[PDB]
Amino acid sequence: CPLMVKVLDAVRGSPAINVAMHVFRKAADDTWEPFASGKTSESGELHGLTTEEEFVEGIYKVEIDTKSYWKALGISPFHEHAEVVFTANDSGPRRYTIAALLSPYSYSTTAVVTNP
Amino acid sequence: CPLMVKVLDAVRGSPAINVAMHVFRKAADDTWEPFASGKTSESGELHGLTTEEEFVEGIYKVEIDTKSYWKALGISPFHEHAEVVFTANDSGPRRYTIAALLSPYSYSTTAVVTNP
Amino acid sequence: CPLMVKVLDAVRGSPAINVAMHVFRKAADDTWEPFASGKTSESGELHGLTTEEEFVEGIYKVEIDTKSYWKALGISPFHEHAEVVFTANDSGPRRYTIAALLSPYSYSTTAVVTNP
Amino acid sequence: CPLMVKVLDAVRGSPAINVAMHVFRKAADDTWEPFASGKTSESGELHGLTTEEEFVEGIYKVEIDTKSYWKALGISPFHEHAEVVFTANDSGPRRYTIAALLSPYSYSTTAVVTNP
Numbered sequence A, B, C, D: 001c002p003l004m005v006k007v008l009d010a011v012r013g014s015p016a017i018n019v020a021m022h023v024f025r026k027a028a029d030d031t032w033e034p035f036a037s038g039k040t041s042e043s044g045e046l047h048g049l050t051t052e053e054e055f056v057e058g059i060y061k062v063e064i065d066t067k068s069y070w071k072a073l074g075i076s077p078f079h080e081h082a083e084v085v086f087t088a089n090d091s092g093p094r095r096y097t098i099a100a101l102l103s104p105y106s107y108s109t110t111a112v113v114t115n116p
């Protein structure tokens, strides 16, 4: 599991469940090619987006559908979504956890990058 | 001043100075029309991006060049940039402060929305 | 104004108004001498806590009554309060802005430290 | 495992390893009785602080020694420590993860509270 995304709800103090996201990889021609997608589980985590052999160096973009999460709780949040864009594996293969901590008018995103 | 962006450096505990950013507005055809740009001042703030007459309802995107900020300081950061995408003035005219708090591997963004 | 505290509400996207806080300074005998107190204004800011002459080196503690803020709004929060403890003026006189960004189950605190 | 504390380093994008912390519980007489202690492991997590039978309702305080973590990397950080104070189990037994995300001049703390 070289890429995992974890989403937390800072209002309820709970995993953010059923949050959709779409991952892209920058192509050689500067275009965003679709790379992976899924939704967070009951623990707020999305595992299995990619594999070690597929997850080569590149610039990746994770678009997290935070607006639908809040709308489903009845709230019009501030942000349309939360995007995380990063270069991956520039110094060799790494395992990435992207964490997103969500409030209606604020979010934080952090990367925990480890070497297996 | 209906739109102000403020950028802080969580490593040094200081305003993030000379941070470039570009602002877009979603057009009727789903495309990002360029809207405004600037660099943060010595206080970490970028004022004067737009006016009340021009800052109509819409979806706006602020792309903050955090990567160049960190590179200039002797640190190679995780994120390529920090993007904030939001609907503005839906209810209607408001003043927005977008704050971004930057660390090399983490950032948070918050909106402070007031009614004059 | 060598010490200012600013409190923001990440749920509503607004200054956190009428938030009480108490400031202490560690005495020579390791005890917390009461130092200053106040409530945030309509802008979420509390100014005038101390003066340059009084704000000497030391360890200071800011206790922010976040629980009463949330309770007053119809939310029972996780934290009893938000405490910020820091050494001040070690190198030497600085101006400090302490920012606290509040959610019911999460808060962040950052210091913006400048040299006049 | 009804109480777990996880500490992350937002500068390096890594678990914060070997971070010491001390946990207290408010006694009937308003005094802080020592409750548990330990240090984070290689994953930045501290497990096994308490048990279900011991972890009764009460107000608990977690003092995280963030200053030593930064000093050991050569840095004089802003905060003396990071304290988290909360009422636990007021509505029945819950499992608590306290996460702390650390930068030299900023930290955030979030609670993820679940019902087994």
Ligand SMILES: N#Cc1cc(Br)c(O)c(Br)c1
Binding pocket: A022, A023, A024, A033, A034, A035, A036, A037
């Ligand atoms: N694989 C894959 C995949 C990538 C993106 Br980006 C998507 O939006 C969806 Br739907 C699937």
Ligand SMILES: N#Cc1cc(Br)c(O)c(Br)c1
Binding pocket: A006, A008, A097, A099, A100, A101, A110, A112, D006, D008, D097, D099, D101, D112
């Ligand atoms: N922010 C944040 C954050 C919170 C939790 Br709890 C995690 O397990 C990780 Br990884 C990151």
Ligand SMILES: N#Cc1cc(Br)c(O)c(Br)c1
Binding pocket: B022, B023, B024, B033, B034, B035, B036, B037
């Ligand atoms: N007005 C304006 C303006 C908008 C965008 Br976006 C830019 O990247 C630059 Br340069 C200027």
Ligand SMILES: N#Cc1cc(Br)c(O)c(Br)c1
Binding pocket: C022, C023, C024, C033, C034, C035, C036, C037
């Ligand atoms: N000056 C002062 C002052 C300090 C603290 Br410690 C207080 O709780 C209050 Br009331 C006032």
Ligand SMILES: N#Cc1cc(Br)c(O)c(Br)c1
Binding pocket: B006, B008, B097, B099, B101, B112, C006, C008, C097, C099, C101, C110, C112
């Ligand atoms: N975090 C944070 C934060 C700090 C400052 Br000094 C601000 O003015 C705003 Br607005 C947000």
Ligand SMILES: N#Cc1cc(Br)c(O)c(Br)c1
Binding pocket: D022, D023, D024, D033, D034, D035, D036, D037
């Ligand atoms: N059990 C226990 C225990 C609690 C706290 Br307070 C401590 O600081 C240490 Br040392 C141990």
